[PDB]
Coordinates of C-alpha atoms and ligand atoms in Angstrom, one line a residue:
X1 CA 28.2 -16.9 9.0
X2 CA 26.0 -19.4 10.7
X3 CA 23.1 -17.0 10.3
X4 CA 22.4 -18.8 7.0
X5 CA 19.6 -20.5 8.9
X6 CA 16.3 -18.6 8.9
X7 CA 12.9 -19.1 7.3
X8 CA 13.1 -17.1 4.0
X9 CA 11.8 -18.1 0.6
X10 CA 14.0 -20.5 -1.4
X11 CA 16.8 -20.7 1.2
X12 CA 18.1 -24.2 1.9
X13 CA 17.3 -23.7 5.6
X14 CA 13.6 -22.8 5.0
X15 CA 13.5 -25.1 2.0
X16 CA 13.2 -28.4 3.9
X17 CA 11.2 -26.9 6.8
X18 CA 8.5 -27.3 4.1
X19 CA 9.2 -30.9 2.9
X20 CA 11.8 -32.5 5.3
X21 CA 14.4 -35.0 3.9
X22 CA 14.1 -37.5 6.8
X23 CA 12.4 -40.9 6.8
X24 CA 10.7 -40.6 10.2
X25 CA 9.4 -43.8 11.8
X26 CA 6.5 -44.3 14.2
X27 CA 6.2 -47.7 16.0
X28 CA 3.3 -48.8 18.1
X29 CA 3.4 -51.2 21.0
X30 CA 0.3 -52.5 22.7
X31 CA -0.3 -54.1 26.1
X32 CA -2.3 -57.2 25.7
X33 CA -4.3 -58.0 28.9
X34 CA -3.8 -61.6 29.7
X35 CA -5.9 -62.0 32.9
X36 CA -8.9 -59.6 32.4
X37 CA -11.3 -61.6 34.4
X38 CA -9.1 -61.6 37.5
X39 CA -8.4 -58.0 37.0
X40 CA -12.1 -57.4 37.6
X41 CA -12.3 -59.8 40.6
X42 CA -9.6 -57.6 42.1
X43 CA -6.2 -59.2 41.3
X44 CA -3.2 -57.3 39.9
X45 CA -3.2 -56.9 36.1
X46 CA -0.9 -59.1 34.1
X47 CA 0.0 -57.7 30.6
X48 CA 1.9 -59.0 27.6
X49 CA 3.3 -56.5 25.1
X50 CA 2.9 -56.7 21.3
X51 CA 4.8 -54.7 18.8
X52 CA 6.3 -53.1 16.9
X53 CA 3.7 -52.0 14.4
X54 CA 5.8 -49.7 12.3
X55 CA 4.4 -46.9 10.1
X56 CA 6.5 -44.6 8.0
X57 CA 5.6 -40.9 8.1
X58 CA 4.8 -38.5 5.3
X59 CA 5.3 -34.9 6.4
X60 CA 4.4 -31.8 4.5
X61 CA 3.7 -28.4 6.2
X62 CA 1.3 -26.3 4.1
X63 CA -1.1 -23.3 4.3
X64 CA 1.8 -20.8 4.5
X65 CA 1.5 -17.1 4.6
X66 CA 4.3 -14.8 5.8
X67 CA 3.8 -11.6 7.9
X68 CA 5.1 -8.7 9.9
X69 CA 7.7 -7.5 7.4
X70 CA 9.2 -11.0 7.3
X71 CA 9.6 -11.8 11.0
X72 CA 6.7 -14.4 11.4
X73 CA 5.3 -17.3 9.4
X74 CA 2.1 -19.4 9.7
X75 CA 1.4 -23.0 8.7
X76 CA 0.1 -26.4 9.7
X77 CA 2.3 -29.4 10.3
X78 CA 0.6 -32.1 8.3
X79 CA 1.2 -35.8 9.0
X80 CA 0.3 -39.2 7.5
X81 CA 1.2 -42.8 8.0
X82 CA 2.2 -45.7 5.7
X83 CA 2.3 -49.2 7.1
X84 CA 5.3 -51.4 6.4
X85 CA 4.6 -55.1 6.7
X86 CA 8.2 -56.1 6.7
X87 CA 9.5 -53.9 9.5
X88 CA 6.5 -54.7 11.8
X89 CA 5.9 -57.8 13.8
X90 CA 2.5 -58.8 12.3
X91 CA -0.4 -57.4 10.4
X92 CA -2.4 -54.6 12.2
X93 CA -5.6 -55.8 10.5
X94 CA -5.1 -59.4 11.4
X95 CA -3.7 -59.3 15.0
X96 CA -5.9 -58.9 18.1
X97 CA -5.4 -56.9 21.2
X98 CA -7.6 -57.3 24.3
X99 CA -7.7 -54.2 26.4
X100 CA -9.9 -51.6 28.1
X101 CA -13.0 -50.5 26.2
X102 CA -12.4 -46.8 26.4
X103 CA -15.7 -45.5 25.0
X104 CA -17.6 -47.0 28.0
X105 CA -14.9 -45.8 30.4
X106 CA -15.2 -42.4 28.9
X107 CA -19.1 -42.2 28.9
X108 CA -18.8 -43.2 32.6
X109 CA -16.8 -40.1 33.5
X110 CA -18.8 -38.2 30.8
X111 CA -21.7 -38.7 33.2
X112 CA -21.4 -36.3 36.1
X113 CA -25.2 -36.2 36.6
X114 CA -27.2 -38.6 38.8
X115 CA -29.9 -39.4 36.3
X116 CA -27.2 -39.7 33.7
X117 CA -25.3 -42.2 35.9
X118 CA -28.7 -44.0 36.3
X119 CA -29.6 -44.0 32.6
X120 CA -26.2 -44.5 31.1
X121 CA -25.9 -47.4 33.5
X122 CA -29.1 -49.0 32.1
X123 CA -27.5 -49.0 28.7
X124 CA -24.5 -51.2 29.6
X125 CA -26.7 -53.8 31.3
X126 CA -29.1 -54.0 28.4
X127 CA -26.5 -54.0 25.7
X128 CA -24.3 -56.6 27.4
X129 CA -21.2 -54.4 27.6
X130 CA -18.1 -55.6 29.3
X131 CA -15.0 -53.7 30.5
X132 CA -12.3 -55.6 28.6
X133 CA -12.5 -55.9 24.9
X134 CA -10.7 -57.5 21.9
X135 CA -9.9 -55.6 18.7
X136 CA -7.6 -55.6 15.7
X137 CA -4.4 -53.5 15.9
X138 CA -5.7 -51.5 12.9
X139 CA -9.0 -50.9 14.6
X140 CA -7.7 -49.6 18.0
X141 CA -5.2 -47.4 16.1
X142 CA -7.5 -46.0 13.5
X143 CA -11.1 -46.6 14.0
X144 CA -13.9 -48.9 15.0
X145 CA -17.7 -48.2 15.5
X146 CA -18.7 -48.8 19.1
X147 CA -22.3 -50.0 19.9
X148 CA -22.3 -47.4 22.7
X149 CA -21.1 -44.4 20.8
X150 CA -23.3 -45.4 18.0
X151 CA -26.3 -44.8 20.2
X152 CA -25.1 -41.5 21.7
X153 CA -24.9 -40.2 18.2
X154 CA -28.6 -40.8 17.7
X155 CA -29.2 -38.6 20.8
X156 CA -26.3 -36.1 21.1
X157 CA -25.1 -35.9 17.4
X158 CA -22.0 -33.7 18.2
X159 CA -20.4 -36.9 19.4
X160 CA -18.8 -39.0 16.6
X161 CA -19.9 -42.7 16.4
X162 CA -16.4 -44.0 15.7
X163 CA -13.5 -44.4 18.1
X164 CA -9.8 -45.0 17.6
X165 CA -6.6 -44.0 19.4
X166 CA -5.9 -41.9 16.4
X167 CA -9.3 -41.2 14.7
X168 CA -9.4 -39.0 11.6
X169 CA -5.8 -38.1 12.2
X170 CA -4.2 -39.7 9.1
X171 CA -3.4 -36.9 6.7
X172 CA -4.5 -34.1 9.0
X173 CA -2.6 -31.6 11.2
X174 CA -2.1 -31.0 14.9
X175 CA -3.5 -27.5 14.4
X176 CA -2.5 -24.1 12.9
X177 CA 0.7 -22.5 14.1
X178 CA 2.7 -19.3 13.7
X179 CA 6.5 -19.6 14.0
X180 CA 9.0 -16.8 14.6
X181 CA 11.5 -16.8 11.8
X182 CA 15.1 -16.4 12.5
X183 CA 15.3 -12.8 11.3
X184 CA 14.7 -11.0 14.6
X185 CA 17.4 -13.2 16.1
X186 CA 19.0 -16.6 15.5
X187 CA 17.7 -17.7 18.9
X188 CA 14.0 -17.4 18.1
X189 CA 14.3 -19.6 14.9
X190 CA 11.3 -21.9 14.5
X191 CA 10.1 -20.9 18.0
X192 CA 6.3 -21.0 18.6
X193 CA 4.1 -18.0 19.6
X194 CA 0.5 -18.3 18.5
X195 CA -1.2 -21.7 18.3
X196 CA -4.7 -21.4 17.1
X197 CA -4.2 -17.7 18.0
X198 CA -3.7 -18.8 21.6
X199 CA -0.6 -17.1 22.9
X200 CA -0.9 -19.1 26.0
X201 CA -2.7 -22.4 26.9
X202 CA -6.1 -22.1 28.6
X203 CA -6.5 -25.3 30.6
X204 CA -3.8 -25.5 33.3
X205 CA -3.8 -23.7 36.6
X206 CA -0.7 -21.5 36.9
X207 CA 0.4 -19.2 34.1
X208 CA 3.8 -20.9 34.1
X209 CA 2.2 -24.2 33.3
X210 CA -0.2 -22.7 30.7
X211 CA 2.7 -21.0 28.9
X212 CA 4.0 -22.0 25.5
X213 CA 7.8 -22.4 25.2
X214 CA 10.2 -23.6 22.5
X215 CA 10.0 -25.1 19.1
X216 CA 7.6 -27.6 17.6
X217 CA 10.2 -30.2 18.4
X218 CA 11.7 -31.2 15.0
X219 CA 14.4 -28.5 15.1
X220 CA 16.3 -26.0 17.1
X221 CA 18.2 -22.7 16.8
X222 CA 21.9 -22.7 15.8
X223 CA 24.7 -22.7 18.4
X224 CA 23.0 -25.2 20.8
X225 CA 25.5 -25.2 23.7
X226 CA 26.1 -27.7 26.5
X227 CA 24.9 -25.5 29.4
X228 CA 21.7 -24.1 27.9
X229 CA 18.4 -26.0 28.1
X230 CA 15.8 -26.4 25.2
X231 CA 12.1 -25.9 25.2
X232 CA 9.7 -28.0 23.1
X233 CA 5.9 -28.0 22.6
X234 CA 4.6 -31.3 21.4
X235 CA 0.9 -31.0 20.7
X236 CA -0.3 -34.6 21.5
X237 CA 1.4 -34.5 24.9
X238 CA -0.7 -31.4 25.9
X239 CA 2.0 -29.4 27.7
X240 CA 5.2 -27.4 27.0
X241 CA 8.2 -29.6 27.8
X242 CA 12.0 -29.1 28.0
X243 CA 15.1 -31.3 27.5
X244 CA 18.6 -31.2 29.1
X245 CA 22.1 -31.7 27.9
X246 CA 23.7 -35.2 28.5
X247 CA 26.9 -35.7 26.5
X248 CA 28.8 -35.4 23.3
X249 CA 28.2 -38.1 20.6
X250 CA 29.0 -38.7 17.0
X251 CA 26.0 -39.8 14.9
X252 CA 26.8 -40.8 11.4
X253 CA 29.6 -38.4 10.4
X254 CA 28.8 -35.5 12.7
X255 CA 29.3 -34.1 16.2
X256 CA 26.2 -34.4 18.3
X257 CA 24.6 -33.2 21.5
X258 CA 22.8 -36.0 23.4
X259 CA 19.7 -34.5 25.0
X260 CA 17.4 -36.6 27.2
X261 CA 14.2 -35.7 29.0
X262 CA 15.1 -34.9 32.7
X263 CA 13.2 -36.2 35.7
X264 CA 12.1 -32.8 37.1
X265 CA 9.6 -32.5 34.2
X266 CA 7.2 -35.3 35.2
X267 CA 7.6 -35.4 39.1
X268 CA 5.7 -33.9 42.1
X269 CA 7.3 -30.5 42.7
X270 CA 6.4 -26.9 43.4
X271 CA 7.4 -26.0 39.8
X272 CA 5.1 -28.6 38.1
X273 CA 2.3 -27.9 40.5
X274 CA -0.3 -26.3 38.2
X275 CA -0.8 -29.5 36.2
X276 CA -2.9 -31.1 38.9
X277 CA -6.5 -30.2 38.1
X278 CA -7.7 -31.2 41.6
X279 CA -6.3 -27.8 42.7
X280 CA -3.0 -29.2 43.9
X281 CA -3.7 -32.9 44.2
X282 CA -1.1 -34.7 42.1
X283 CA -1.4 -38.3 40.8
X284 CA 2.3 -39.0 41.3
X285 CA 5.8 -38.6 39.9
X286 CA 6.0 -39.6 36.2
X287 CA 2.5 -39.4 34.9
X288 CA 0.2 -36.7 33.5
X289 CA -3.5 -36.0 33.7
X290 CA -4.4 -35.0 30.1
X291 CA -8.1 -35.6 30.6
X292 CA -8.8 -31.9 29.9
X293 CA -7.3 -31.7 26.5
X294 CA -8.4 -35.2 25.5
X295 CA -12.1 -34.1 25.5
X296 CA -12.7 -35.1 29.1
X297 CA -11.9 -38.8 28.8
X298 CA -9.9 -40.4 31.6
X299 CA -6.5 -40.3 29.9
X300 CA -3.1 -40.5 31.5
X301 CA 0.2 -39.8 29.5
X302 CA 3.3 -41.4 30.9
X303 CA 6.7 -42.7 29.8
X304 CA 7.0 -46.2 28.3
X305 CA 6.7 -48.9 31.0
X306 CA 6.3 -46.1 33.6
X307 CA 10.0 -45.2 33.3
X308 CA 10.8 -42.1 35.5
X309 CA 7.6 -42.7 37.5
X310 CA 7.0 -43.6 41.1
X311 CA 7.6 -47.3 41.6
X312 CA 4.2 -47.5 43.1
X313 CA 3.0 -47.3 39.5
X314 CA 5.3 -50.0 38.1
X315 CA 4.1 -52.1 41.1
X316 CA 0.5 -52.0 40.1
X317 CA 1.0 -53.8 36.8
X318 CA 3.1 -56.9 36.6
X319 CA 4.7 -57.1 33.2
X320 CA 6.2 -53.6 33.4
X321 CA 10.0 -53.3 32.9
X322 CA 11.2 -49.7 32.5
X323 CA 14.8 -49.4 31.4
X324 CA 16.6 -46.2 30.5
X325 CA 18.0 -47.7 27.3
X326 CA 14.7 -48.7 25.7
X327 CA 12.1 -46.3 27.3
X328 CA 13.9 -43.0 27.6
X329 CA 13.5 -40.1 25.1
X330 CA 16.7 -38.7 23.6
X331 CA 17.5 -36.4 20.8
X332 CA 20.8 -35.9 19.1
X333 CA 21.3 -32.4 17.7
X334 CA 24.1 -30.7 15.6
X335 CA 25.4 -28.1 18.1
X336 CA 26.1 -25.7 15.2
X337 CA 23.1 -25.7 12.9
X338 CA 20.4 -26.9 15.4
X339 CA 19.6 -29.8 13.1
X340 CA 18.2 -33.1 14.5
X341 CA 20.2 -36.1 13.5
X342 CA 19.4 -39.1 15.7
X343 CA 16.2 -38.8 17.7
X344 CA 13.8 -41.2 19.4
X345 CA 10.6 -39.9 20.9
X346 CA 8.8 -42.3 23.3
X347 CA 5.6 -41.7 25.4
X348 CA 2.8 -43.9 26.7
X349 CA -1.0 -43.8 26.9
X350 CA -2.9 -45.0 29.9
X351 CA -6.5 -45.0 31.1
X352 CA -7.2 -44.1 34.7
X353 CA -9.5 -46.8 36.2
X354 CA -11.1 -47.3 39.6
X355 CA -13.9 -49.3 41.2
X356 CA -17.5 -48.0 40.9
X357 CA -20.4 -49.3 42.9
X358 CA -22.8 -47.6 40.5
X359 CA -21.4 -49.5 37.5
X360 CA -21.5 -53.3 37.7
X361 CA -19.0 -53.5 34.8
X362 CA -16.1 -52.0 36.7
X363 CA -16.4 -54.7 39.3
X364 CA -13.8 -55.0 42.1
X365 CA -11.0 -53.7 39.9
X366 CA -8.0 -52.0 41.6
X367 CA -7.6 -48.3 41.6
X368 CA -4.7 -47.7 39.1
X369 CA -3.2 -46.0 36.1
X370 CA -3.8 -48.7 33.5
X371 CA -1.6 -48.7 30.3
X372 CA -3.0 -49.2 26.9
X373 CA -0.1 -48.7 24.6
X374 CA 3.0 -46.7 23.9
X375 CA 5.1 -45.7 20.8
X376 CA 8.5 -44.7 19.5
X377 CA 8.6 -41.8 17.1
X378 CA 12.1 -42.2 15.8
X379 CA 14.5 -40.9 13.1
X380 CA 17.9 -41.5 11.8
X381 CA 20.0 -39.7 9.2
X382 CA 21.3 -41.7 6.2
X383 CA 24.7 -41.6 4.5
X384 CA 23.6 -39.6 1.5
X385 CA 22.5 -36.5 3.5
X386 CA 25.3 -36.8 6.1
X387 CA 27.9 -35.7 3.6
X388 CA 25.6 -33.0 2.3
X389 CA 25.5 -31.6 5.8
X390 CA 29.2 -32.2 6.3
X391 CA 29.6 -30.2 3.1
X392 CA 27.4 -27.2 4.1
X393 CA 29.2 -27.1 7.4
Ligands
LIG1 C1 12.0 -47.5 19.3 O1 11.8 -47.9 20.7 C2 12.0 -49.3 21.0 C3 12.2 -49.3 22.5 O2 11.1 -48.9 23.2 C4 13.2 -50.0 20.3 O3 13.0 -51.4 20.3 C5 14.0 -52.0 21.2 O4 15.3 -52.0 20.5 C6 16.3 -52.5 21.4 C7 17.6 -52.3 20.6 O5 17.6 -51.1 19.9 C8 16.1 -53.9 21.8 O6 17.1 -54.2 22.8 C9 17.7 -55.5 22.7 O7 17.0 -56.6 23.3 C10 17.6 -57.9 23.2 C11 16.8 -58.9 23.9 O8 15.4 -58.6 23.6 C12 19.0 -57.8 23.8 O9 19.7 -59.1 23.5 C13 19.8 -56.7 23.3 O10 21.0 -56.6 24.1 C14 22.1 -56.3 23.2 O11 22.3 -55.0 23.0 C15 22.8 -54.2 24.1 C16 22.9 -52.8 23.7 O12 21.6 -52.3 23.5 C17 24.1 -54.8 24.6 O13 24.5 -54.1 25.8 C18 23.8 -56.3 25.0 O14 25.0 -56.8 25.6 C19 23.4 -57.0 23.7 O15 24.3 -56.6 22.6 C20 25.0 -57.6 22.1 O16 25.7 -58.4 23.1 C21 26.5 -59.5 22.7 C22 27.2 -60.2 23.8 O17 26.2 -60.7 24.7 C23 27.6 -59.0 21.7 O18 28.3 -60.1 21.1 C24 26.9 -58.2 20.5 O19 27.8 -57.7 19.6 C25 26.0 -57.1 21.1 N1 25.3 -56.4 20.0 C26 24.9 -55.1 20.2 C27 24.2 -54.4 19.0 O20 25.2 -54.5 21.2 C28 19.1 -55.4 23.3 O21 19.0 -55.0 24.7 C29 14.7 -54.1 22.4 O22 14.4 -55.5 22.5 C30 13.6 -53.4 21.5 N2 12.3 -53.5 22.3 C31 11.1 -53.4 21.7 C32 10.0 -53.5 22.6 O23 11.0 -53.3 20.5 C33 13.3 -49.5 18.9 O24 14.5 -50.0 18.2 C34 13.3 -48.0 18.8 N3 13.7 -47.4 17.5 C35 13.6 -48.0 16.3 C36 14.2 -47.2 15.2 O25 13.1 -49.1 16.2
LIG2 C1 -3.9 -60.8 22.8 O1 -4.6 -61.6 23.7 C2 -5.8 -62.1 23.2 C3 -6.5 -62.8 24.3 O2 -5.7 -63.9 24.9 C4 -5.6 -63.0 22.0 O3 -6.8 -63.3 21.4 C5 -7.0 -64.6 21.0 O4 -6.3 -65.0 19.8 C6 -6.5 -66.4 19.5 C7 -5.6 -66.7 18.3 O5 -4.3 -66.2 18.6 C8 -8.0 -66.7 19.1 O6 -8.1 -68.1 19.1 C9 -9.0 -68.5 18.0 O7 -10.3 -68.6 18.4 C10 -11.2 -69.1 17.4 C11 -12.6 -69.2 18.0 O8 -12.9 -68.0 18.6 C12 -10.8 -70.6 16.9 O9 -11.6 -71.0 15.9 C13 -9.3 -70.6 16.5 O10 -8.9 -72.0 16.4 C14 -7.7 -72.2 15.7 O11 -6.7 -72.5 16.7 C15 -5.4 -73.2 16.2 C16 -4.6 -72.1 15.6 O12 -4.4 -71.0 16.6 C17 -5.7 -74.3 15.3 O13 -5.1 -75.5 15.8 C18 -7.2 -74.6 15.1 O14 -7.4 -75.6 14.1 C19 -7.9 -73.3 14.6 O15 -7.3 -72.9 13.4 C20 -8.4 -69.9 17.5 O16 -8.3 -70.8 18.7 C21 -8.9 -66.2 20.3 O17 -10.2 -66.1 19.9 C22 -8.5 -64.8 20.7 N1 -9.3 -64.4 21.9 C23 -10.2 -63.4 22.0 C24 -10.9 -63.3 23.3 O18 -10.4 -62.7 21.1 C25 -4.7 -62.3 20.9 O19 -4.3 -63.2 19.9 C26 -3.5 -61.7 21.6 N2 -2.7 -60.9 20.6 C27 -1.5 -61.1 20.3 C28 -0.8 -60.2 19.3 O20 -0.8 -62.0 20.9
LIG3 C1 -8.0 -35.3 36.0 O1 -8.5 -34.0 35.7 C2 -10.0 -34.1 35.6 C3 -10.4 -32.8 35.0 O2 -10.1 -32.8 33.6 C4 -10.5 -34.3 37.0 O3 -11.9 -34.2 37.0 C5 -12.5 -33.2 37.9 O4 -12.6 -33.7 39.2 C6 -13.1 -32.8 40.2 C7 -13.0 -33.4 41.5 O5 -11.7 -33.2 42.1 C8 -14.6 -32.4 39.8 O6 -15.0 -31.4 40.6 C9 -16.3 -31.4 41.2 O7 -17.4 -31.8 40.3 C10 -18.7 -31.7 40.8 C11 -19.7 -32.2 39.8 O8 -19.7 -31.3 38.7 C12 -19.0 -30.2 41.3 O9 -20.3 -30.2 41.9 C13 -18.0 -29.8 42.3 O10 -18.2 -28.5 42.7 C14 -16.6 -30.0 41.8 O11 -16.4 -29.0 40.8 C15 -14.6 -31.9 38.3 O12 -16.0 -31.9 37.9 C16 -13.8 -32.8 37.4 N1 -13.6 -32.1 36.1 C17 -14.1 -32.6 34.9 C18 -13.8 -31.7 33.7 O13 -14.7 -33.6 34.8 C19 -10.0 -35.6 37.5 O14 -10.4 -35.8 38.9 C20 -8.5 -35.9 37.4 N2 -8.2 -37.3 37.5 C21 -7.5 -37.8 38.5 C22 -7.3 -39.3 38.4 O15 -7.0 -37.1 39.4
LIG4 C1 -3.1 -42.9 5.6 O1 -3.4 -42.2 4.3 C2 -2.4 -42.4 3.3 C3 -2.7 -41.5 2.2 O2 -4.1 -41.5 1.8 C4 -2.3 -43.9 3.0 O3 -1.2 -44.1 2.2 C5 -1.4 -44.2 0.7 O4 -2.7 -44.3 0.0 C6 -3.3 -45.5 -0.4 C7 -3.9 -46.2 0.8 O5 -4.9 -47.2 0.4 C8 -2.2 -46.4 -1.1 O6 -1.9 -45.8 -2.4 C9 -1.0 -46.6 -0.3 O7 -1.3 -47.3 0.9 C10 -0.4 -45.2 0.1 N1 0.3 -44.6 -1.1 C11 1.2 -43.6 -1.0 C12 1.8 -43.1 -2.3 O8 1.6 -43.2 0.1 C13 -2.2 -44.8 4.2 O9 -2.4 -46.1 3.8 C14 -3.1 -44.4 5.3 N2 -2.7 -45.1 6.5 C15 -3.6 -45.8 7.3 C16 -3.1 -46.5 8.5 O10 -4.8 -45.8 7.0
LIG5 C1 8.2 -21.6 29.9 O1 9.3 -20.7 29.9 C2 9.7 -20.0 31.0 C3 11.0 -19.4 30.7 O2 11.7 -20.3 29.8 C4 9.8 -21.0 32.2 O3 10.0 -20.2 33.4 C5 11.4 -20.2 33.9 O4 11.5 -21.2 34.9 C6 12.8 -21.2 35.5 C7 12.7 -22.4 36.5 O5 11.3 -22.8 36.7 C8 13.1 -19.9 36.2 O6 14.4 -20.0 36.8 C9 13.0 -18.8 35.2 O7 13.2 -17.5 35.8 C10 11.6 -18.8 34.5 N1 11.6 -17.8 33.5 C11 10.4 -17.2 33.1 C12 10.5 -16.1 32.0 O8 9.4 -17.4 33.7 C13 8.6 -21.8 32.4 O9 8.8 -22.8 33.4 C14 8.2 -22.5 31.1 N2 7.0 -23.2 31.3 C15 6.8 -24.5 30.9 C16 5.5 -25.1 31.2 O10 7.7 -25.1 30.4
NAG6 C1 13.8 -13.0 20.4 O1 15.0 -13.2 21.1 C2 15.6 -12.0 21.5 C3 16.9 -12.4 22.2 O2 16.8 -12.1 23.6 C4 14.7 -11.1 22.4 O3 15.3 -9.8 22.5 C5 13.3 -11.0 21.7 O4 12.4 -10.4 22.6 C6 12.8 -12.4 21.3 N1 11.5 -12.3 20.7 C7 10.4 -12.1 21.5 C8 9.1 -12.0 20.8 O5 10.5 -12.0 22.7
NAG7 C1 3.2 -33.6 46.3 O1 4.0 -32.8 47.2 C2 3.4 -31.9 48.0 C3 4.4 -31.2 48.8 O2 5.6 -30.9 48.1 C4 2.3 -32.6 48.9 O3 1.6 -31.6 49.7 C5 1.4 -33.4 48.0 O4 0.4 -34.0 48.8 C6 2.2 -34.4 47.2 N1 1.3 -35.2 46.3 C7 1.5 -36.5 46.1 C8 0.6 -37.2 45.2 O5 2.4 -37.1 46.7

């Protein structure tokens, strides 16, 4: 039967859930701020966009121990990145990107205390710290030592000196999971239950919001059918998300189910309500306040070029051009096995920024959600393993 797919030792199904066959590609795109001065003086930001910077991923999920008479399994998804100079636009070490200096933006919200605002302000004046800063693509991505964080270490050592969009994340995991193997049913295959032992999320408001649904996102149960809707829990995005059925496609050799990410997921609605930390005050349709799970930094997740978000957002930054073709997030699954064939995962990263009279560095700047960069986590199935799947099916 089609019940050949479960996590059990040695089986072809489980086999590659350990080391997957697929050359997954992550591509970074940065927003270069071309009129930083005027941004401060109060104009509308003008950005240019540089990318792709393409890394190839190495995925191995280790630290495995089974349990509960064979119905559960625990591991960590481990992930690393290899830079390809040919398939990227330029060299991440050579090329420069001018953009927000987040450590200062962060230590500014990190100060909720009046004497802290006072003192932490003194720092920026004396150290000659500006709001907009120029770094190398490699630096922003991976790490650079900031003059400001360097100090905070000498005081409050728990805080790391370095900063990078991904810092200390090359070769590490997104945390320790436990997946329900497909024994108890074919439906609960590679579904998630306990993440760091947390059987629900702590930091949203409503229980619905806090809940953990669906797979890790690299796979689904067999018999995916046109009507039914799929749940996914990407870690870096901080919430449980779901996809809907679009249409029938053929990718490489196989039949496929096109699944996009529907609008009702990121909008202002009674269902999505509990994701607004200000007790029911929402930022708008199409963005997320991730500032809780990002350590308290002013971070806003969104879709590339604000796609699916209230036009009032696309309006705030000139140089934004969302189109469904480039900026959506689809996935193409095999309706029988629940295997992912053609998939492109695209989300953005923004810093919430507004004027502050206490801090001279923020100047007259507009109150807005300000984009730093976005990425495409893609994948494509080659010819060699297309036949092998056509075989097994
Ligand atoms: C990861 O995510 C990013 C997106 O965020 C992807 O990068 C994008 O890739 C797109 C294509 O995959 C690029 O889009 C192209 O942009 C060109 C101009 O910049 C434009 O000329 C292209 O338009 C053609 O393709 C369309 C189909 O997409 C057609 O409808 C259109 O008419 C053009 O197609 C040709 O048309 C002529 C007639 O005019 C025909 O004679 C040709 O035969 C047609 N050829 C084809 C193939 O149709 C297209 O819009 C986009 O620029 C790029 N953006 C960035 C920022 O990188 C990544 O690819 C994605 N995944 C991976 C794995 O990289
Ligand atoms: C993102 O935007 C930023 C800001 O606009 C941009 O940074 C700038 O990059 C240029 C090069 O592309 C840097 O210009 C250099 O500056 C040094 C002095 O600081 C000069 O010595 C250099 O002179 C050369 O210029 C010509 C070649 O470019 C030659 O004719 C000449 O003989 C020299 O070889 C050069 O002008 C500039 O310093 C930065 N600006 C800042 C503030 O860092 C960045 O390049 C953009 N990124 C992308 C990917 O487009
Ligand atoms: C995104 O979410 C963050 C939380 O992660 C929001 O920050 C929170 O803002 C509220 C104000 O609505 C703060 O509440 C008040 O703080 C003061 C000072 O401590 C206190 O005396 C009041 O009683 C009240 O609790 C709250 O402190 C703050 N939370 C954190 C963790 O900083 C933020 O406003 C959201 N961003 C946007 C753009 O909406
Ligand atoms: C992330 O770490 C990996 C693994 O350490 C790096 O990839 C490899 O390791 C060294 C790096 O100097 C070199 O042998 C090659 O670059 C890689 N070899 C193999 C076999 O993969 C990778 O460079 C790191 N990525 C970043 C952006 O730092
Ligand atoms: C997590 O999963 C549950 C069930 O899949 C989602 O709650 C369902 O929501 C729909 C529409 O909101 C209702 O028609 C169902 O009755 C609900 N079922 C249950 C069991 O609650 C919940 O929305 C999901 N949460 C997130 C954050 O995705
Ligand atoms: C697994 O799916 C079946 C199908 O409805 C359900 O009976 C069972 O409760 C699911 N597992 C858990 C832990 O709920
Ligand atoms: C979101 O919608 C609710 C009513 O559905 C409204 O009370 C709230 O103020 C809205 N928030 C925004 C940011 O539009």
